[PDB]
Amino acid sequence: TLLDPLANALSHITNSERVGKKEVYLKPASKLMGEVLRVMQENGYIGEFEFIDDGRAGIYRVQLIGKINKAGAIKPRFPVKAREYEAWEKRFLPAFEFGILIVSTSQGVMTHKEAIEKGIGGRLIAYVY
Amino acid sequence: MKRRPRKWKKKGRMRWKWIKKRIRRLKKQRRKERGLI
Amino acid sequence: GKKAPYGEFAGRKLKLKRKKFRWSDIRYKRRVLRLKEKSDPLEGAPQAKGIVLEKIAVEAKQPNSAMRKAVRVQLIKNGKVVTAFTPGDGAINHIDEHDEVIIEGIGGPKGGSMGDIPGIRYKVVKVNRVSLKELVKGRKEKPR
Amino acid sequence: MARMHARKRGKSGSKRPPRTAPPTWVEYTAEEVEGLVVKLRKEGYSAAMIGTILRDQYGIPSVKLITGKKITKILEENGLAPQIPEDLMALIRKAVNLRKHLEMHPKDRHSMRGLQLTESKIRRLVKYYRRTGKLPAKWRYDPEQAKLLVR
Amino acid sequence: LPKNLIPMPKSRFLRVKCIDCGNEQIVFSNPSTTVRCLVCGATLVEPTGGKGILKAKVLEVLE
RNA sequence: GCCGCUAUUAUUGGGCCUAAAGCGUCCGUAGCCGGGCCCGUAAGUCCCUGGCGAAAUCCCACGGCUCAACCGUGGGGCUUGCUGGGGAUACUGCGGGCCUUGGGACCGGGAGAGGCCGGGGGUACCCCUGGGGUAGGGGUGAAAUCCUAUAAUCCCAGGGGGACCGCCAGUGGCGAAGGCGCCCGGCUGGAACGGGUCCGACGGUGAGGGACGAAGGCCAGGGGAGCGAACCGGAUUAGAUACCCGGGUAGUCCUGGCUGUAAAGGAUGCGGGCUAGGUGUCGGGCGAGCUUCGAGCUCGCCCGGUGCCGAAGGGAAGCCGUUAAGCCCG
Numbered sequence: 001t002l003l004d005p006l007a008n009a010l011s012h013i014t015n016s017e018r019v020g021k022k023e024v025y026l027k028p029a030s031k032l033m034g035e036v037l038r039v040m041q042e043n044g045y046i047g048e049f050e051f052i053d054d055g056r057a058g059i060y061r062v063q064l065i066g067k068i069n070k071a072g073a074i075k076p077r078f079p080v081k082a083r084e085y086e087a088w089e090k091r092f093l094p095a096f097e098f099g100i101l102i103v104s105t106s107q108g109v110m111t112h113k114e115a116i117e118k119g120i121g122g123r124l125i126a127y128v129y
Numbered sequence: 130m131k132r133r134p135r136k137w138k139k140k141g142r143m144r145w146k147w148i149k150k151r152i153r154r155l156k157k158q159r160r161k162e163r164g165l166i
Numbered sequence: 167g168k169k170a171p172y173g174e175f176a177g178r179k180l181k182l183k184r185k186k187f188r189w190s191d192i193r194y195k196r197r198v199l200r201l202k203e204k205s206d207p208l209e210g211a212p213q214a215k216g217i218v219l220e221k222i223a224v225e226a227k228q229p230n231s232a233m234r235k236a237v238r239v240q241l242i243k244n245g246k247v248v249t250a251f252t253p254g255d256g257a258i259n260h261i262d263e264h265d266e267v268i269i270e271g272i273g274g275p276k277g278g279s280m281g282d283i284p285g286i287r288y289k290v291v292k293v294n295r296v297s298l299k300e301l302v303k304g305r306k307e308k309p310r
Numbered sequence: 311m312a313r314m315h316a317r318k319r320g321k322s323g324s325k326r327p328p329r330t331a332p333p334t335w336v337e338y339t340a341e342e343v344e345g346l347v348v349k350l351r352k353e354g355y356s357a358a359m360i361g362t363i364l365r366d367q368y369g370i371p372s373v374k375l376i377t378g379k380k381i382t383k384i385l386e387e388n389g390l391a392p393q394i395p396e397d398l399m400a401l402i403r404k405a406v407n408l409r410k411h412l413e414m415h416p417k418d419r420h421s422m423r424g425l426q427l428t429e430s431k432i433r434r435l436v437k438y439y440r441r442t443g444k445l446p447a448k449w450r451y452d453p454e455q456a457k458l459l460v461r
Numbered sequence: 462l463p464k465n466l467i468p469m470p471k472s473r474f475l476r477v478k479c480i481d482c483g484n485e486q487i488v489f490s491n492p493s494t495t496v497r498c499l500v501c502g503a504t505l506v507e508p509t510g511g512k513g514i515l516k517a518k519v520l521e522v523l524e
Numbered sequence: 525g526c527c528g529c530u531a532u533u534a535u536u537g538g539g540c541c542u543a544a545a546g547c548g549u550c551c552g553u554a555g556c557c558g559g560g561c562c563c564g565u566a567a568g569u570c571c572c573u574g575g576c577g578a579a580a581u582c583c584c585a586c587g588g589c590u591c592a593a594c595c596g597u598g599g600g601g602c603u604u605g606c607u608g609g610g611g612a613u614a615c616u617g618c619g620g621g622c623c624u625u626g627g628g629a630c631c632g633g634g635a636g637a638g639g640c641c642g643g644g645g646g647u648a649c650c651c652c653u654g655g656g657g658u659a660g661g662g663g664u665g666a667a668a669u670c671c672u673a674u675a676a677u678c679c680c681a682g683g684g685g686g687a688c689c690g691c692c693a694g695u696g697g698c699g700a701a702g703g704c705g706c707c708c709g710g711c712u713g714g715a716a717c718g719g720g721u722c723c724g725a726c727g728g729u730g731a732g733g734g735a736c737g738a739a740g741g742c743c744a745g746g747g748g749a750g751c752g753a754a755c756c757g758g759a760u761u762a763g764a765u766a767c768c769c770g771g772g773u774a775g776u777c778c779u780g781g782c783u784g785u786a787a788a789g790g791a792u793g794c795g796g797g798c799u800a801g802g803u804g805u806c807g808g809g810c811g812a813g814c815u816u817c818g819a820g821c822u823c824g825c826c827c828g829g830u831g832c833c834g835a836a837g838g839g840a841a842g843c844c845g846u847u848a849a850g851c852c853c854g
């Protein structure tokens with residue numbers, strides 16, 4: 001059944017970007033979907049996201065800007081020390097600082113770059129390039 | 130039996146129904162000469 | 167569907183299935199059950215020594231026409247008869263009966279038969295402690 | 311939601327609108343709404359039927375919106391909530407009636423399958439309600455004990 | 462944005478009055494039960510597969 | 525011989541319509557995967573630090589044998605790691621609490637060859653009886669076997685029998701699949717729609733395990749019209765252990781059991797989300813219009829089924845294409 005709203009959201013973004021849609025709606029919203037979108041906005045992959053509120057888990061309206069090739073969840077949320085991001089980059093991204101691996105840490109949800117400059121690891125949950 | 134559609138084809142083969150029937154006759158003879166005679 | 171166990175805590179069942187289908191791998195099976203060692207008359211060796219019992223000839227498959235010379239050879243380590251092909255042109259004449267002969271593999275794909283020789287797996291290499299190549303090219307005459 | 315043994319993607323259902331506050335057109339207060347709930351349970355209606363009647367007759371949408379509480383919460387407060395839960399009870403009544411049918415009709419294997427699926431649902435809910443305490447841990451479905459239960 | 466975002470009811474609650482007593486009463490448009498007047502016992506809406514058929518609403522409102 | 529080649533073992537990273545490959549279908553145990561919010565814990569996880577994980581071996585620099593290999597000095601790594609503390613708390617887990625979208629229950633009016641049981645019928649076919657009427661009928665490519673002069677075929681009036689339910693009947697419907705078609709009544713299953721109804725994550729998949737499961741076959745007991753394996757005859761043919769013809773046993777039907785196989789096929793496992801639509805059709809609902817005022821007709825919309833087509837896309841291609849063989853989550 002439903003499992004990982006985050007993966008579903010990312011796949012939706014990916015498919016909508018392939019077909020040139022300007023806005024997507026992510027229906028089983030989460031604080032994690034929101035943090036991931038915060039990061040994607042900050043690194044300039046999407047435009048503007050707003051939380052719509054129903055009586056249910058809430059929706060996210062997400063305005064895109066044509067800067068995504070592949071966005072996806074690393075679903076075995078892989079533990080990663082502060083000195084293995086090289087390898088996980090090589091697995092998930094095409095060039096050396098091209099995209100963004102999103103990492104959940106004890107100090108929040110971050111990019112692997114910020115994690116590196118903080119010297120903290122965590123768990124990988126998504127990639128975006 | 131476990132069967133194979135590949136075997137059911139006929140390009141260079143005899144018909145599988147009849148291959149099967151032959152196999153079963155042999156098996157019957159063997160079973161027959163094994164347990165009681 | 168998406169493949170079997172992909173979960174973070176599913177390594178057990180994952181390992182299990184990979185093992186299950188390695189057993190469908192036939193190379194792994196032969197290596198691990200040691201089937202070659204059980205069915206090999208050379209007993210896991212690259213060469214072997216044998217006594218020539220008889221000299222024979224073998225017809226090439228279908229399109230080729232020739233009588234490939236060979237010898238039936240009794241191997242000493244086990245007393246087992248195998249047939250070996252004598253490369254060269256007058257090799258079968260340089261070879262005689264009751265002669266000690268060394269037995270290599272003929273090459274061939276799966277340690278097996280080679281070319282238009284249907285069912286011969288072995289080569290003759292030495293004859294009474296002398297290479298058949300040299301005997302054939304004339305040098306190094308035979309002791310006995 | 312034929313899902314669970316039929317796998318049809320049925321979508322029939324209710325569409326509650328997002329409501330942080332009750333509607334202003336509503337006449338009744340929480341107290342008299344509770345009184346109506348209790349009245350109808352004494353009339354012998356299940357909680358589902360109570361909500362249905364309060365929706366259709368009295369124009370009460372979402373007793374939860376009004377009172378802040380659920381119908382079964384109100385019933386257990388006034389000492390009227392059912393011993394075993396209603397959905398389980400309903401399934402058990404179905405199963406008993408079907409047992410009777412199937413004793414007089416042994417060759418109705420399709421209805422026998424319906425019974426099997428009904429009892430599967432029973433077992434699922436029993437597992438969940440044992441886990442949550444709404445039944446004792448030692449509770450277990452049995453056809454004859456369930457017959458005595460219904461009766 | 463339309464017709465699946467925030468799935469909203471098509472049904473309405475609507476105020477009606479009986480022809481016999483004349484008491485205004487709120488009801489539901491898609492009832493599962495025959496709705497009766499709280500005072501007279503008169504059927505105000507008869508149930509169907511969907512939108513109930515309305516008796517006794519000659520002065521009506523809908524919310 | 526081992527590694528590589530080999531993404532021919534695939535965690536990275538393979539495939540299962542037609543090439544090897546989706547259990548016949550369902551149910552469910554363990555296992556694995558699991559909606560959203562709040563609080564806590566801090567087990568996994570991350571950081572920092574203490575103690576260990578011998579030396580040799582590996583990498584690097586620098587030195588000594590002419591350089592090198594070799595050796596030494598030092599730095600690092602290696603050993604699957606284990607452990608003592610301290611800190612963080614996003615994710616997972618554990619505990620508690622709230623929710624309602626997923627699922628379950630309920631209600632309502634409908635639909636449907638879903639199933640079981642009873643009753644009532646419909647032709648047709650076969651036999652018997654009686655009447656008529658005489659010389660052939662039947663069958664084939666052509667013939668014959670066979671039936672018939674004890675009266676056949678044909679026609680007519682009666683009786684009996686067993687099976688089976690035509691046309692309507694459809695890319696139709698119901699069902700997990702197998703499969704299910706005369707009508708009427710009774711018992712019963714499941715689904716869709718409508719639903720500001722209830723419960724409140726109860727869910728998915730399912731090793732093992734269980735249930736159902738076409739025809740056929742077997743045990744026992746009944747029945748036996750038609751058809752009819754085996755068999756028996758007539759032909760055909762070079763032959764004809766067959767195809768054609770005439771008969772005919774089991775069987776086909778019923779009861780109760782076993783068997784548990786099929787091109788059991790959508791040759792496509794199940795669930796969930798996303799990615800243009802068009803046009804039909806079934807069911808329910810809504811809104812309009814028309815009406816012979818009909819459980820009626822037409823148009824549109826929503827949901828759910830079932831089909832065709834189809835851009836993008838996919839694919840070895842055929843073909844698939846929101847009922848994916850596409851992307852993602854199991």
Ligand SMILES: [Mg+2]
Nearest residue numbers: 190191192532
């Ligand atoms: Mg292979």
Ligand SMILES: [Mg+2]
Nearest residue numbers: 531532538539
């Ligand atoms: Mg392959």
Ligand SMILES: [Mg+2]
Nearest residue numbers: 134135543545
């Ligand atoms: Mg195949």
Ligand SMILES: [Mg+2]
Nearest residue numbers: 578579580602
């Ligand atoms: Mg060491």
Ligand SMILES: [Mg+2]
Nearest residue numbers: 833834844845
């Ligand atoms: Mg097409």
Ligand SMILES: [Zn+2]
Nearest residue numbers: 479482498501
């Ligand atoms: Zn009134």
